[PDB]
Amino acid sequence: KKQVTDLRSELLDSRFGAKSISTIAESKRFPLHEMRDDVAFQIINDELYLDGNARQNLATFCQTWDDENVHKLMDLSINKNWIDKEEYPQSAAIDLRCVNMVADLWHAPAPKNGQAVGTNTIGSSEACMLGGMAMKWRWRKRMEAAGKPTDKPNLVCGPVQICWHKFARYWDVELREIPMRPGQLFMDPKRMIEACDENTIGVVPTFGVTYTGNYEFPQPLHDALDKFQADTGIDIDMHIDAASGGFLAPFVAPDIVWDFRLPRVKSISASGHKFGLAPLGCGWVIWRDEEALPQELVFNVDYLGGQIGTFAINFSRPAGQVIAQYYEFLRLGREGYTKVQNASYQVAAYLADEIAKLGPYEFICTGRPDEGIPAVCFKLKDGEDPGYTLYDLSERLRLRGWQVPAFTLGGEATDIVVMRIMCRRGFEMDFAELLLEDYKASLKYLSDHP
Amino acid sequence: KKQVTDLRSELLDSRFGAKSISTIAESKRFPLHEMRDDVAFQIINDELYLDGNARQNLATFCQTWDDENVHKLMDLSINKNWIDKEEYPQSAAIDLRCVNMVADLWHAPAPKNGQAVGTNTIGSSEACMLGGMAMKWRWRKRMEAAGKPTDKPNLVCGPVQICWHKFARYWDVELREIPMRPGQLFMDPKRMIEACDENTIGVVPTFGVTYTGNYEFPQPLHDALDKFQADTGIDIDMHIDAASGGFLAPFVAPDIVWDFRLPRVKSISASGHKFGLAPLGCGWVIWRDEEALPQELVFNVDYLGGQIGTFAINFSRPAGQVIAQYYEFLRLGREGYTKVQNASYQVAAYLADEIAKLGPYEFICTGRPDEGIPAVCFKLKDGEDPGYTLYDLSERLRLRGWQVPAFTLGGEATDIVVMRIMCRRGFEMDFAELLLEDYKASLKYLSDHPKLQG
Amino acid sequence: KKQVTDLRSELLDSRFGAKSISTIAESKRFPLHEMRDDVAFQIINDELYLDGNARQNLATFCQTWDDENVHKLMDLSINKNWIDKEEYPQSAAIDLRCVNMVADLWHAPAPKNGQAVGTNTIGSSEACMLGGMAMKWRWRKRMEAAGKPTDKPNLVCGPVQICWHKFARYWDVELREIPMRPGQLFMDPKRMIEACDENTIGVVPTFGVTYTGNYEFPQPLHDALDKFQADTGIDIDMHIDAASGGFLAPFVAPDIVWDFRLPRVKSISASGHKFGLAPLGCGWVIWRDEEALPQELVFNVDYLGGQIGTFAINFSRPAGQVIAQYYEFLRLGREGYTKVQNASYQVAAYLADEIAKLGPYEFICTGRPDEGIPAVCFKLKDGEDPGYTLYDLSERLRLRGWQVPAFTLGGEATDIVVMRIMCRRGFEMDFAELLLEDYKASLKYLSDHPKLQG
Amino acid sequence: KKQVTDLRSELLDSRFGAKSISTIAESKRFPLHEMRDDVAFQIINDELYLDGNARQNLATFCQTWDDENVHKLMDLSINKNWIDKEEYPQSAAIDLRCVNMVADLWHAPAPKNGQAVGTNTIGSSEACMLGGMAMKWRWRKRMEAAGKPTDKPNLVCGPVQICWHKFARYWDVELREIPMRPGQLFMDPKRMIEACDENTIGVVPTFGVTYTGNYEFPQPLHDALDKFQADTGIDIDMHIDAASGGFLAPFVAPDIVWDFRLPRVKSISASGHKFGLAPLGCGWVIWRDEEALPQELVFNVDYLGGQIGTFAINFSRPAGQVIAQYYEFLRLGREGYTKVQNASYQVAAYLADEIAKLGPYEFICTGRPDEGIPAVCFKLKDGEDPGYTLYDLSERLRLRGWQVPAFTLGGEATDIVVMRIMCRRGFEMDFAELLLEDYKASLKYLSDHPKLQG
Ligand SMILES: *Cc1c(COP(=O)(O)O)cnc(C)c1O
Ligand SMILES: *Cc1c(COP(=O)(O)O)cnc(C)c1O
Ligand SMILES: *Cc1c(COP(=O)(O)O)cnc(C)c1O
Ligand SMILES: *Cc1c(COP(=O)(O)O)cnc(C)c1O
């Protein structure tokens, strides 16, 4: 009668008084028995509190807030498979409208057949990899036409995000990164050209450098590639990594010439889940036209009496993010995106101005729309010692729940330490004012505790 | 006044009487102005009905239902970034626990340092590419150890899913796919050996072929690779693509030796969102140990005072799916998964038995746990003409919302047409009985209208 | 022009693109204009994230989790007024049942008229003040029965919670607080008697000391008061402040004689929202009988053709907490409470055991049901220097969201520094294991960074 | 087999078919066993229907409705502790903002340090007690400076709410209440002065008398006190009990000089949960400056590197109401509050006009913003006999679920019976029209049944 005794408790026991919640969760072997669903949920729900608060995570570029309709659309699409174009046909059609809209946003040549060349991805990483493969294949064909070897490809770039290093390693391409150096934390024309040769598959300007928040302007680089071809005969194209900038500049700094308005840009990628306002799991890559995308890389699938071209690394995945993306496009439009991005820039500019009053800092980024993304990036003025480092300050801020990263730059600037604050949607003026309060309090604490 | 009058309507108009819903949604250019959020949601919500009913989609292998707690965990984790190990450390800790559990499920050698070698992925596609890259690299090392050229790698396999064709194309590897042929819809030992040579980076058995639903058993192939090494000195590894079988066999057919219990299996991949019961966006790949994974492919990141290795093609992505996976592991356990998979096999066998009574069919898969996944796959018996093709039957069933695919096999079986029914979680016996009723009705309709044949 | 376009934006603008959310919230004067309700809610909701996580708050004794039915009862009762007995008759009746239940739990003499003498309160503070007032009044009557002056009352006690200092100040009573001494962090019989005299209105044993988590046992003190009356003729009563212990001992240590089983105990108070499992806003005070509560302090009100006495400092307040309490009483009962409290002690004992293996500590409280509440309290062994102070450790833990207090004891132990961990409902074993991991990581960091010392 | 059979039933039985719901709820002793949570919730949920529909309760002054955002905010803050300023620092910050806003609303001298002197409370009762203690303490210091006894304090007031009778009893203060009398149901200057002497700790004018709904105007009384000091040298201050009026006059009758604009007003208290639109559990008390609040009554606590003074009777309690109060302040502003209050006054004025047409009534309050609160209070004209009493009418209305109190006034007006209708937020015009319809029906019934009179 022991079995019956324990079963009775298993039925009537409360959530925290239950035997199944009296032990530490399994972390080594596959669990043997099934257990009360409420206890299983409670345990995991509580463990997740150790992740901290996403709204206070100021180190990330990804969306940490979504409105009610996106929550509903995501829940409604939880089981809609993005890859099954024939089984989820309307989801696929929506995806295609987004491709057209993004292509239009980036000034891609108007599609004669009514459909821009491009695709949704899980994020910029996959988007950049697809962009890199196409870049590699176009180069191979160029060299084959020239009768030259194709076994030593290289890629020229500036302070790229880690996905490009992974591309380099996984696709055996030599990465020629122009290192940052004091006063020049990016790839300038001169050093770019110095790294280019006939084995260069392309150049990748980062329209919104992660480490600094500033844009690498493609035009001056584009001018240098034109000169290079006129001098050497070598014709190099560009892929713009606009993970962040792709959904900012079009709305707040439309005159910046960085997209398909530039002849050598054959493809551009961006993260919908960054400033594109979509929930985690949405990326985009667009090609200027069909000739920029080698067909050998596209796998066609049947779609409504015909066949659509697919180019992806992943296969099955949720279609909720693209649906959410389309919702934002329709609900906000250019007008809405401008208002939302302007709100971010206002907050970045505010913090930039206020923080400048509190210490001997030299800013790298101050939330200016014509210079980069809505972020504040600074370092202590060389030789200035206020009695603390940005690492200590970063730590004091974390005591209040904020994640504000302090880190060293790369290349020839490794001796420089910077602090970066990202101002995304959902980091409203009032909320950022609280951060300013904790910053002042942290400084005051560091001054009284040397 | 016109302006204020229009604004008054914009504020007071009902959902369907509003001016903003009187037009066709944009599909060509980025929208110019903002609009009422309720109208935007409504328009899209309604368009999505044209996707049909996923619960009636019997063509997919992916989860079409999730319990309430998973819905809650997914909603709570909508903004948790899987890649940010330092910013979302407990999500990272949970993911690592799942790696251990899946590695354990597949009999991987127990990790001496407490952490198995492997990673979560968006799905089996990424998992397979990671496994494939590791294979190419290990092969290169093997060849370079003997001073031989590595310019012509090839991969030997059977009727694989399209992701392996993509792998071959993207990574410049020659795919040597042994084709299907009547009576042998898989990669048999004899033909496998024929295709293998010094340039083979590895063999990929499909533990659960999509086309037929049957398992390609790794053991007999393993025995062949042993003899192959004895005769030629060529040592070939295996990567098991257990996209479906990975979360089935361990529960309902433990006696099948297909995993790390086999020495040549250096890695295994499977889809959590298929029979792993996780929501779309979850896959797994495990390596038997440190030596099976080239560190040159791993990018280390800072994590709680130390470092964690990362091998992934994607970067930022939601952590909800892996959190949901862990919940299923904890809530169900071996006992629970066994009961859920048992229910699927019950239905598959029911339908296989019932449908057999309705026509001149030859079954390729009958939902037997010892032969493959919970699926029903059959063709019309050679030479018989019931007055209809499976294509016609498929179309009739679609009139009632069901998506039951009818298709021709590949290789040397391109003239054979099969119909496949997938029995996933959420396709309970009662629901399946309704399908059977529609099947019977479709058959009576086809018999009354002999012209539909063709 | 401007007014119209502005209103359009006000109507169509999204949450964060709205002009109204472009500024800092008002904090000095009453706002002049009305604003979008979604923006007002959003701003406040977001500000509240700076409060941190209540579940990781290990400093509080109050409930930080409530089940769904309680969330529902509270929402349904948001506007039910506890004081209006005639207007909310059944809420009143339920409250009265709770009084009988708590009185029963504490062994109060069975009430002849079917209703125990006592009342619900906002918390132990008001309850203690009511008990203190009755105490002062009974003392006055005793003194007046012999024609003696009542201008110099004093109250004898040990390491009491701040509410007794407030009672002493507000009601002009001299608080004779026996200070903590190393090895004697409580009011012992000998010192209690030294402080007692004819002007003592009562003795207040703290059955669950906040600073240490240990029980001050009323039995030994009661024996001392018996001897004291025998020796001096002075008869002194007790009021037990069982804010925490009143909802612990009855379930996990029934043999401790601390309640109305002791003749001199004329009243007992406790916090429902502490270990009574009620949501914030519920306290209790019970008197052993009619004679223990001076009628002059009670205000009778009409109630269903009759009258019931009321004794409270507050007037209008929500009835939800007492309704929630009754639900917990009925849903859990003695069996359920015993299981929830056992879970807390299990966790406290766990942490006590594991933390001991991490440093030169001397424990004051180790989560033993026979010595006190479910808490872990410790200090560094005298003379030992592990390279850090508990203050530094507390600070490191806060980096992970945990609020674990480190503070000096009072009295003659102001030189001692302790760290106290509260183990409440909702601080399950798995969650506590995460804290332990953070403790281990903090210690390693502190060992790698000596400068942090002090 | 019996134990297992009944267990199966406990699992499968429906809500009302379960054995656990087959008995009467416990009401005498602490429950022994734990029971199904759904049955426990159901039983209590159902018992609560016996309370009156709060929306139809026209006797209460407290909020009987709150918007959706307040419900959400309250649910989110169910466990935030108002007292732990250091553990819930932002909740504390928001509270202080409210203190500033309320002080500003009442014209308190602008705080030089940026923070007004005052505090949030559970309701007006605690606020008034805090206000009273401060008056008592200031008086004592005045007397001690004069070298006069402080053992016979008294307080002068008009028809105050019961909380002042409690203050008087609990703090041993002699209450000198000026009684109501025909013609003047309040404290007039002449009779106030006649009760004042050197032992008077202060005067408490009620800015919104509960019994009548009319305001007691502080100005003429303040004038009398100035003259009294000039004639006797006795300096007496005031504390305004603006429980209701505090959140009315500022918005709809700005010109009434009743607040800090008056020199003798050293403190004011009001109920946030009455016309302040906050949910039950919120009150306020503001002091004109630091000098008006004796420091010996404040207990300072650590707050963000500094210290914040606290003065409260309760300790732990929910922070949800203050957060909700701040939300209302921000969402409505002076514009929003004026609209909501104007709404109540329009409804009260409507009922007053309509009810006057139905019988021989003499109105004491007709919902005029310059005279008092949004209420209707009347009596039968002296001598007139319509064939019923207001008690009978009150009873007929209760048959329709309405709670409309009928009661006798106090003092020298005990022979006067009045009926009072409270028009709160949420008692919209349409709703009140239904009441008017029932009032007419009750009258027609009382006329058709003459023997009901009495
Ligand atoms: C964040 C980022 C990426 C990676 O994009 P995901 O969306 O995280 O995959 C790539 N490039 C740049 C410049 C980035 O900022
Ligand atoms: C479905 C499937 C895949 C692809 O897996 P995803 O989760 O869709 O990426 C790969 N291999 C096999 C055998 C499959 O069935
Ligand atoms: C917490 C506590 C109090 C105060 O009770 P509240 O519920 O916070 O008003 C009083 N006494 C003791 C011993 C306590 O622990
Ligand atoms: C209602 C009222 C009180 C009591 O205030 P609570 O908020 O109910 O505690 C005190 N004075 C007056 C004049 C009142 O109307």
The span from the CA of B92 to the CA of C258, in Å, is 49
| Alpha helices in A266-379, H assignment, sequence order | 320-356
Closest CA to C344 of A44, A6, A43, A17: A17
Q: Is B124 annotated as a binding residue?
A: yes
Q: Which two structure tokens, joined as six digits, stand for C234?
A: 């002075």
**What sign for the dihedral angle of Cα C117, C123, C129, C132?**
positive
Same domain, C108 and C135: yes
Identity of the residue in B3, B36, B305 whose CB atom sits nearest the CB atom of C12: B36
- Regarding the beta carbon of B161 and ligand 2, being less than 6 Å apart is answered yes
Place of tokens 């002999």: B450
Phi, psi torsion values for D175, nearest 5 degrees:
-85, 120
B15, B24, B35, B51: best to mutate for the A interface, most A CBs within 10 A? B51
Cβ-proximal residues to A107 (8 Å cutoff; 6+ apart), any chain:
A259, A260, A261
CB pairs under 8 A between A and D: 24
> How are beta strands B306-310 and B174-177 bridged, if at all?
unpaired
Q: Is A212 annotated as a binding residue?
A: no
- Regarding the beta carbon of D283 and ligand 4, being less than 6 Å apart is answered yes
B349 three-class SS: helix
For residues A32 and A378, the answer to whether their CB atoms sit within 8 Å is: no
In this structure, which ligand is nearest to the CA of B321? 2
Which residues make beta-bridge pairs with A309?
A300
One DSSP character per residue, D5-17 reads HHHHHHHH--TTT
Is B330 touching C (CB cutoff 8 A)? no
Pairwise CB contact (< 8 Å): A339 & C55:
no
Neighbours of D300 (CB within 10 A): 11
In this structure, which ligand is nearest to the CA of B316? 1
Is D107 touching A (CB cutoff 8 A)? no
Q: Which of residues 49-78 of C touch D (CB under 8 A)?
A: 49-52, 54, 57, 59-60, 62-67, 69, 71-78
What's the total number of domains in chain A?
Answer: 3
Exposed (0-12), middle (13-18) or buried (19+): which is D423, by Cβ within 10 Å? buried
Identity of the residue in A8, A12, A441 whose CB atom sits nearest the CB atom of D305: A441
Pairwise CB contact (< 8 Å): B31 & A333:
yes
The residue count of chain D comes to 454
Pairwise CB contact (< 8 Å): B35 & C13:
no
Tell me which amino acid residue B252 is.
Answer: V
Neighbours of C384 (CB within 10 A): 11
Which residues make beta-bridge pairs with A120?
A284
Same domain, C147 and C47: no
* Residue identifier of the C-alpha nearest atom 8 of ligand 2: A316
> How are beta strands D174-177 and D154-157 bridged, if at all?
parallel
Touching status, chains A and C (3+ beta-carbon pairs under 8 Å): yes
Q: Which two structure tokens, joined as six digits, stand for A96?
A: 């295609």
Q: What's the CA dihedral at A196, A201, A206, A209 to 10 degrees?
A: -70
Same domain, D172 and D86: yes
Same domain, A79 and A197: yes
Pairwise CB contact (< 8 Å): D90 & A13:
no
CA angle centred on D36, ends D33 and D39, rounded to 5°: 115
Widest distance between CA atoms in chain B: 93
Closest CA to A348 of A373, A322, A328, A375: A375
**Contact residues on chain B for A166, CB-CB shorter than 8 A:** 299, 313
DSSP state, residue A49? G
Q: Which two structure tokens, joined as six digits, stand for B248?
A: 């089935």
B38, B61, B277, B317: best to mutate for the A interface, most A CBs within 10 A? B317
Same domain, C54 and C71: no
One DSSP character per residue, D209-229 reads -TTT-BBPPHHHHHHHHHHHH
Closest CA to B432 of B357, B344, B370, B362: B344
- From B399's Cα to the closest Cα of chain C, the distance in A is 42
- Regarding the beta carbon of B206 and ligand 2, being less than 6 Å apart is answered yes
For residues A362 and A378, the answer to whether their CB atoms sit within 8 Å is: yes
Touching status, chains B and A (3+ beta-carbon pairs under 8 Å): yes
> How are beta strands C200-204 and C154-157 bridged, if at all?
parallel
Compute, in angstroms, the gap from residue C370 CA to the centroid of ligand 3.
21
Compute, in angstroms, the gap from residue D327 CA to the centroid of ligand 4.
22
C280, C321, C332, C340: best to mutate for the D interface, most D CBs within 10 A? C280
Which residues make beta-bridge pairs with C203?
C156, C238
Is A329 touching B (CB cutoff 8 A)? yes
The span from the CA of D47 to the CA of A5, in Å, is 32
Same domain, A235 and A171: yes
Neighbours of chain D (3+ CB pairs under 8 A): A, C
CATH number of the domain where residue A240 is located: 3.40.640.10
Phi, psi torsion values for B169, nearest 5 degrees:
-70, -45
Which residues make beta-bridge pairs with C175?
C155
**What sign for the dihedral angle of Cα C112, C114, C119, C123?**
positive
Atom of ligand 3 nearest to the CA of C125: 9
- Regarding the beta carbon of A240 and ligand 1, being less than 6 Å apart is answered no
Same domain, D276 and D411: no
Which residues make beta-bridge pairs with C309?
C300
Closest CA to A136 of A204, A192, A218, A188: A204
Same domain, C25 and C38: yes
Compute, in angstroms, the gap from residue C199 CA to the centroid of ligand 4.
36
Atom of ligand 3 nearest to the CA of C208: 13
The span from the CA of C358 to the CA of B201, in Å, is 50
Is A399 touching C (CB cutoff 8 A)? yes
Q: Which among D63, D81, D112 is the end of a domain?
A: D63
The span from the CA of D155 to the CA of D201, in Å, is 6
CATH number of the domain where residue D399 is located: 3.90.1150.160
- Regarding the beta carbon of D163 and ligand 4, being less than 6 Å apart is answered yes
CATH number of the domain where residue A54 is located: 4.10.280.50
Q: Of all residues in chain C, what percent are helix, strand and coil, respectively (each to 5)?
A: 45, 15, 40
Q: Which among D357, D377, D398 is the end of a domain?
A: D357
Is A2 touching D (CB cutoff 8 A)? no
The span from the CA of C98 to the CA of C38, in Å, is 40
- Regarding the beta carbon of D14 and ligand 3, being less than 6 Å apart is answered no
Experimental method: X-ray
For residues C116 and C260, the answer to whether their CB atoms sit within 8 Å is: no
Neighbours of D25 (CB within 10 A): 16
Q: Which among B18, B48, B63 is the end of a domain?
A: B63
Atom of ligand 2 nearest to the CA of B283: 7
A402 three-class SS: coil
- Regarding the beta carbon of B244 and ligand 2, being less than 6 Å apart is answered yes
Q: What's the CA dihedral at B408, B409, B414, B418 to 10 degrees?
A: -40
User: After which residues does chain A become discontinuous at a C–N distance over 2.5 Å?
Assistant: none
Closest CA to D139 of D87, D204, D230: D204
**Contact residues on chain D for A7, CB-CB shorter than 8 A:** 7
Q: Which two structure tokens, joined as six digits, stand for D140?
A: 């004592």
Q: Which of residues 168-207 of C touch A (CB under 8 A)?
A: none
Same domain, D343 and D387: no
Neighbours of C370 (CB within 10 A): 10
Closest CA to C274 of C63, C57, C58, C428: C63
Cβ-proximal residues to C136 (8 Å cutoff; 6+ apart), any chain:
C153, C171, C173, C201
The span from the CA of C402 to the CA of B368, in Å, is 52
Q: What is the resolution of this structure in A?
A: 2.0
Is C110 touching B (CB cutoff 8 A)? no
> How are beta strands A118-121 and A283-287 bridged, if at all?
antiparallel
Same domain, C250 and C153: yes
The residue count of chain A comes to 450
For residues B25 and A330, the answer to whether their CB atoms sit within 8 Å is: yes
In this structure, which ligand is nearest to the CA of B161? 2
In this structure, which ligand is nearest to the CA of A208? 1
For residues C276 and C336, the answer to whether their CB atoms sit within 8 Å is: no
For residues D202 and D238, the answer to whether their CB atoms sit within 8 Å is: yes
Pairwise CB contact (< 8 Å): D34 & A11:
no
DSSP state, residue D6? H
Phi, psi torsion values for D8, nearest 5 degrees:
-55, -45
Same domain, C242 and C314: yes
Is C30 touching D (CB cutoff 8 A)? yes
The span from the CA of B293 to the CA of B103, in Å, is 14
Closest CA to C374 of C123, C58, C56: C58
- Regarding the beta carbon of D271 and ligand 4, being less than 6 Å apart is answered yes
Cβ-proximal residues to D24 (8 Å cutoff; 6+ apart), any chain:
none
Pairwise CB contact (< 8 Å): A13 & C336:
yes
| Alpha helices in B122-264, H assignment, sequence order | 124-144, 163-170, 189-195, 218-232, 249-252
Residue A419: which domain range?
Answer: 358-450
The span from the CA of B9 to the CA of C77, in Å, is 38
For residues C321 and C63, the answer to whether their CB atoms sit within 8 Å is: no
Same domain, A108 and A47: no
